[PDB]
Symmetry: C4
């Protein structure tokens, strides 16, 4: 067993093909399924796994009431093989109301964060054992990616944030080798607010596309150099923007270096990646809320902040159905690295009031150099019928 | 680990011995079992698995209502080891309302089809990753085998159909090597309508026995040449015919080259295989509907369309109990290749109205060169008692 | 991986120590557990498994009504690792209302019998595939061991019976090599009626201690020679006898060669093994019915039909609690072969009428050359409270 | 696969980071979870497992009533990978109302005790088979560690106690090699009462920190020499004491050699370990009962019975929430041996009367040479809502 290097060029993408769907919430109307959120997908050399943060409870269960909250002591990182819904035999791999996970080609890394809001602890677990931890540095909700970290030659990188949600915060980028925090670089460059990055291996380094919760509706970009720990940062040029909330297609604008100050308060976790000078990206179809989900390629979208020339649109979830967080993950094909993505289908409170709980199901698509058609893959649960 | 070649002669068959039964529906009266259909069985070099398409729901569950439908976004290919009923820890290995699966002796292939009726996508997943996809070519319900594909020397073949259900349609035969669609041959020969093939390794090529939904009640045969991609096609000569609906034993007839225009509208998935100039085949005992299931050998049945000389009958399911889809699968013994088959035991709507759902259990028999007796292995569930 | 030979002397036994208990029925009052009977335990080179025959249903489930019956089409051989109760993820490894299983040191053998009473089929499954089958030869309930078969140098032996339950029947001993029935020897010697043998590896052959349902209350012994297929048979000399029903300790008697004609009608599956000229054996404490369970060593019990000198008694289940079938199984220690045994704890109909079902839990003890004390390990379920 | 030696120095500890939480009881309000107690955590070379003693029942289940009792025939040692809550597919690895488990780097050892109070049997299971057993020697509740044993060079040591709960009892230390009891040393030294030791590998021997149920509120220490079987014993010097009940921080005192006769009746299982001349230790925050849980380092606490100078306090469970048993376990890092600990969160009778049952959930922390913050990780179940 050797360390992953990801030293392959990126596969040709013409769009995305269906990969996986757990129908979690549909199943939880007759069956004992976890109540969860902030899910993600990472894979080892052999196969793929689905992670989410649990609420220390199942759905048909009295403790599902008020699971609209983001941080409780009862939240754990859940881990199943992709396709297995989160049943009672699901492994809680750590305590976490915030996490990131990745395989370096030998073993698993989990970055797990739990504890008081003003004094969170984050634990680094490698190969089934605790190897390190770190305190919250700025004592205001130390949090991280809510999707996969990335490892290269057995140095793993993760991006974490401690500080304000709607002002300046303190973002750091850790380098972890066999569970051991070996360097901490601090956030540098033109990125102003940075959360919940969706990172991927762009050999010989790592690239993330994040969430600015403060002044931007364009997504931040952070570039991690694995060998020398240097950091550069910016935003996704593309005049069509991926955060939510945002302005409309005609009224929106962006900058390659700055927040665009366009509805920038708040955000949603999301992803994009480059392709020469083009950008592939998903986002919620609806501009103000987490409804629907779409993907497309912005031509010149990576290097030109004026371009709003989208091609290869795909409706992942239709505009009248509920969506949420999404993030990248990358799978080594035989010649090249594929890029894929998951979509959190949030059901329940506060937006839907027919029940007392908040939970999700997931959907997953992978890059394809072949061809594809159309559809919609919503949650599919009937909340009017659900465990009353 | 080496590629399967199947370069062994076919085992002597004198009939079939019991192999497996999941009692799925009986179990779902006290327990959380998937609602499913269009099931099948394929095996790796070591052991066997049971696949079916799910309805994104369990049985005792409000979302089981109206699962009589064939295509929803919530359907996934389920996969367990043979014998394990489809419980909540069951792996949904892809999104699919139509699928085929096979092992090449190194890894798994899944051919998974989902999306809009008029624009379906089909995804090719090998060794835990998406390697290819293709659009529906004729924009009318691109669909496939609903049983195992076949691989030889690590080229896998699958047969798909896009087009009319009760007229001419467009049938293709894909060649897939490590998940990668490497050739597409188009349907050629005297076969007129072709769906849901039950294929098997007849070294050095592949043979399928299909369903003609249009003008035939005899089953079509398609012969895939793996090395040169050439296709030939026809029908099962045997004057005793395997599709359902059909005419009776005295009134029926067949042709080696053409549909017989005998009740040919509609069909049911089914299987047959050759044995010198004889044909082994199963079918529903009842001629117009999916009740009972039987097997027999038609003497001269492979090469003589006038012969109705059956020997070695076996009642798999008695005529007063419900049956359905069946298909072949092949298992490498030590000296030879065995042929086996599964039978879908459909319960529920529309035919049975004591409940709101449609689901199945399965039964499985394997070829034997030994001896056997008699019985019946129906579903065994009491719908009058079932989750009301 | 090499073939088991069992070419080690038998471990010193001074009695038995607790090994395993599944509390199956207690668990089935809040949880979905299989309804089962005729259970057993066999182990591979590494670890042990618990088998039973299912009723195609769980306990809290409408199909549990009338599971007092012995042969339905819905019965399957269940297989879990020892300690795991029979939950919904339990593998049904074949169709069977009668079975035997054993590992030859490379793979699993299952001998599975199902079908019409007057025409049963028995299927031989090795290494995940059907390799052979045989018809019922005398068309009256072909049945077998309901405990582990035994393999030596990769020839496996199993004993089967077709014929009368309360008169002469036809007993055969099959030799199976890699799933393939390679010889059939027929029952020879002074044994008159022979069923449900508990066999074990007494190198260089195999020994069984059976159930005579006709004229004996002493258990039959059958000696299988693996290399030359010759058979000899008799009864357990010991003046203290192991079948149930039987006469009392003072009124009982036995013969080394013949049934003792003492309450001999009926029986119960049970076990014994030799130790120089002594016999270790378990039996129901109660003489007429399946209540309590005990073990002891009869001094001179193996070769002397007049001896009723028991030592080293142990109450496995107390006399006021329900017991049932028991059988041997053998585990290779490092220097020697241990002998162990399981006990079926039957609850329900017909004997207990507070419920509608019939099911069991199990308890397991293993030989010890160390020391031990006392207790009782009954089922422990409250039928007055159970799923009404 | 080689024998564990643990021949590494002990990792630097600055305190403890979160590791694991099963939310067992929260899950059991909608789902079938075991009712359990006296849990623990041990790990093989690769990964960690959570053990507890079951009550032969689930929570929502009629047999959960009166599970306040410590010894029934229906109790088994449960074993899952750490993080998996005790669901119906959980392996009961032996019969036990008292147990200890450990891996020697090749296979598992379980020391399992069950049977009559006045004649208990204890079974030694190694590598999936019974290798030895021993009777209770003093016929008064032979019991053991309720946490992991320790093995070095493939000799495993376990400490057991038979005798009085509130007076002199008979404590022994067994040496077990491949399941085989190879030596028994008897308790020697100044320790007066000794139960439920939390042992760990302090190369070249083993150290335990126990529970004195009689005259001490300071914890006993027992030092096992693996090569020569010699035993020495004493108490934890530290003027801040770890048993419960006890006196307060100002009123308490201790001795390095004797019980302190301070509220010494009763106890609770607990742990401590050394660090030069300092002691790390956890205990219940509340002095008289099992509420809250805390950890700290007593400076000079290992060798100085007058020192009450605590540093590096951490609240594991807050003082208004329920705690219970805790014990050490040790994980081999790459350079050094980490020390971790679990905490039993007991809910139910007798202390809480809103339900009829007694059960637990667990929480687990591991040593860290990094940094950490604060929180509380209580059970989190609402007994006022629980399965009525
Ligand atoms: C079966 O399946 C396929 C795959 O999903 C569908 O084909 C895709 O259709 C979509 C939707 O039209 C295409 O995405 C769109 O591309 C447009 C490009 O405009 C033209 O200009 C270029 C010049 O380079 C031409 O090459 C090209 O042929 C186009 O004619 C964009 O302008 C679109 O964006 C706009 O449309 C949507 C509204 O739908 C708005 O929401 C946007 O804001 C914006 O105004 C869009 O991105 C996609 O490229 C096609 N894919 C492929 C691979 O060809 C089929 O349509 C589908 N069939 C059926 C019946 O459903
Ligand atoms: C115990 O188990 C075995 C195995 O299942 C049964 O034996 C089988 O019995 C079936 C049913 O009769 C046999 O299948 C039939 O074969 C007939 C052959 O006709 C004769 O001619 C040949 C000449 O070559 C002779 O060799 C042979 O002995 C026959 O006498 C077919 O004509 C049958 O088809 C017709 O029968 C059925 C009605 O049952 C109709 O539905 C058909 O449409 C058609 O009219 C049939 O195929 C089978 O061959 C036997 N198997 C074996 C291996 O010998 C036993 O019968 C069973 N015992 C009991 C008591 O149930
Ligand atoms: C703690 O645990 C141990 C192990 O279970 C118990 O010790 C066992 O006790 C049983 C029950 O008495 C013993 O089994 C009995 O052996 C008797 C032998 O008789 C004597 O003669 C021999 C001469 O060779 C002496 O060596 C020996 O010491 C005996 O004194 C049999 O006669 C018994 O059979 C009769 O008793 C039972 C009634 O209990 C009847 O049901 C029978 O039908 C029959 O009449 C019996 O088999 C066993 O040998 C002991 N085992 C060991 C290893 O020593 C302890 O008793 C137990 N302690 C407590 C307090 O429960
Ligand atoms: C964020 O997270 C960290 C880690 O949990 C917290 O820092 C820890 O705080 C605790 C609680 O105060 C510290 O533990 C305490 O240490 C005291 C040492 O006293 C002083 O003297 C030494 C001299 O060597 C100085 O080095 C040191 O700075 C101290 O000022 C003990 O006296 C304490 O024991 C007493 O306090 C508690 C009450 O809380 C009583 O229950 C005891 O009985 C006793 O009277 C205590 O042990 C710990 O050392 C700190 N850890 C680290 C790594 O620095 C932060 O406080 C937290 N931040 C927030 C806002 O919550
Ligand atoms: C660690 C944590 O609490 N993460 C939470 C974040 C933060 O609130 C923002 O990132 C603030 O910066 O976002 C959510 O509220 C959201 O948008 O769905 C949910 C998520 O649980
Ligand atoms: C992809 C798809 O919809 N397959 C369906 C087919 C098609 O309707 C026919 O093959 C039309 O050609 O058959 C069924 O209706 C049937 O007969 O049970 C069910 C199955 O789901
Ligand atoms: C194959 C079969 O039916 N086996 C059954 C046997 C037979 O009735 C006798 O062995 C008749 O010879 O015994 C039982 O009735 C019994 O005693 O509990 C149950 C078991 O299911
Ligand atoms: C084997 C056994 O019964 N162990 C029990 C011990 C003993 O009672 C004491 O150690 C007496 O010495 O402690 C408990 O009561 C307790 O404190 O929670 C529970 C545990 O089940
Ligand atoms: C659910 O939680 C809310 C928030 O605490 C509370 O007001 C309400 O009473 C709860 N309702 C039920 C039915 O549990
Ligand atoms: C990975 O890192 C090691 C450091 O020891 C180095 O020797 C090796 O050459 C590196 N490999 C690549 C492919 O960069
Ligand atoms: C976006 O979501 C809100 C949900 O309340 C809805 O009212 C609004 O119409 C949606 N907007 C668009 C443009 O679809
Ligand atoms: C079931 O579905 C049908 C079809 O939509 C609908 O008319 C009916 O109301 C549903 N019934 C129930 C009880 O859910
Ligand atoms: C299988 O295909 C490869 C192509 O590289 C060929 O070299 C090999 O000989 C083939 N094997 C057989 C048995 O046909
Ligand atoms: C076939 O099935 C239908 C079901 O409605 C039944 O009415 C008919 O009698 C059956 N025919 C035969 C020949 O068994
Ligand atoms: C149970 O089965 C018996 C035997 O057929 C039948 O008479 C009875 O009505 C059944 N009772 C219930 C409640 O299902
Ligand atoms: C087992 O059987 C084989 C037959 O090929 C023989 O060669 C071998 O010596 C036998 N081994 C033993 C230990 O009897
Ligand atoms: C044996 O069992 C029956 C059960 O009905 C009971 O009535 C009888 O008293 C028992 N006999 C003995 C000797 O324990
Ligand atoms: C629970 O157990 C107690 C103790 O035996 C008993 O008195 C009580 O009746 C039981 N209650 C219920 C509801 O089962
Ligand atoms: C300890 O626990 C008991 C529980 O009844 C409580 O009444 C008491 O106040 C607690 N004491 C302290 C010092 O927290
Ligand atoms: Ca349930
Ligand atoms: Ca924003
Ligand atoms: Ca349920
Ligand atoms: Ca047709
Ligand atoms: Ca249930
Ligand atoms: Ca008898
Ligand atoms: Ca339930
Ligand atoms: Ca004490």
């Amino acid at each position: 067993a050797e360390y992953r290097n990801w030293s392959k060029p990126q596969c040709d993408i013409t769009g995305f093909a269906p990969f996986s769907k757990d129908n979690s919430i549909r199943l939880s109307a007759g069956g004992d399924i976890w109540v969860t959120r902030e899910p993600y997908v990472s894979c080892d050399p052999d196969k793929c796994y689905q992670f989410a943060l649990g609420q220390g409870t199942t759905l048909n269960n009295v403790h599902s009431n008020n699971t609209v909250r983001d941080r409780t002591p009862y939240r754990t990182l859940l881990m199943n093989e992709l396709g297995v819904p989160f049943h009672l035999g699901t492994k809680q791999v750590c305590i976490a109301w915030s996490s990131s996970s990745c395989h370096d080609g030998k073993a698993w890394l989990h970055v797990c964060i739990t504890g008081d809001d003003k004094n969170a602890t984050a634990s680094f677990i490698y190969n089934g054992r605790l190897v390190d931890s770190v305190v919250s540095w700025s004592k205001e909700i130390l949090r991280t990616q809510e999707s996969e970290c990335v490892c290269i030659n057995g140095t793993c990188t993760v991006v974490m944030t401690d500080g304000s949600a709607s002002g300046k915060a303190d973002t750091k980028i850790l380098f972890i080798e066999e569970g051991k925090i070996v360097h901490t670089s601090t956030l540098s460059g033109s990125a102003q607010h940075v959360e919940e990055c969706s990172c991927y291996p762009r050999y010989p380094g790592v690239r993330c596309v994040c969430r600015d919760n403060w002044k931007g509706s364009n997504r931040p970009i952070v570039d991690i150099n694995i060998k020398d720990h240097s950091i550069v940062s910016s935003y996704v040029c593309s005049g069509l923007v991926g955060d939510t909330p945002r302005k409309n297609d005609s009224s929106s604008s962006s900058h390659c270096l700055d927040p665009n100050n366009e509805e920038g308060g708040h955000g949603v976790k999301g992803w994009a990646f480059d392709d020469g000078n083009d950008v592939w990206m998903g986002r919620t179809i609806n501009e103000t809320s987490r409804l629907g989900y779409e993907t497309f390629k912005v031509i010149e979208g990576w290097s030109n902040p004026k371009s709003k020339l989208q091609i290869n649109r795909q409706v992942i979830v239709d505009r009248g159905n509920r969506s949420g967080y999404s993030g990248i993950f990358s799978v080594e094909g035989k010649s090249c690295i594929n890029r894929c993505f998951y979509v959190e289908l949030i059901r329940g409170r506060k937006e839907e009031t027919e029940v007392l709980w908040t939970s999700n199901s997931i959907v997953v698509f992978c890059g394809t150099s072949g061809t594809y058609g159309t559809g919609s893959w919503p949650d599919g649960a009937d909340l009017n019928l659900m465990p009353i």
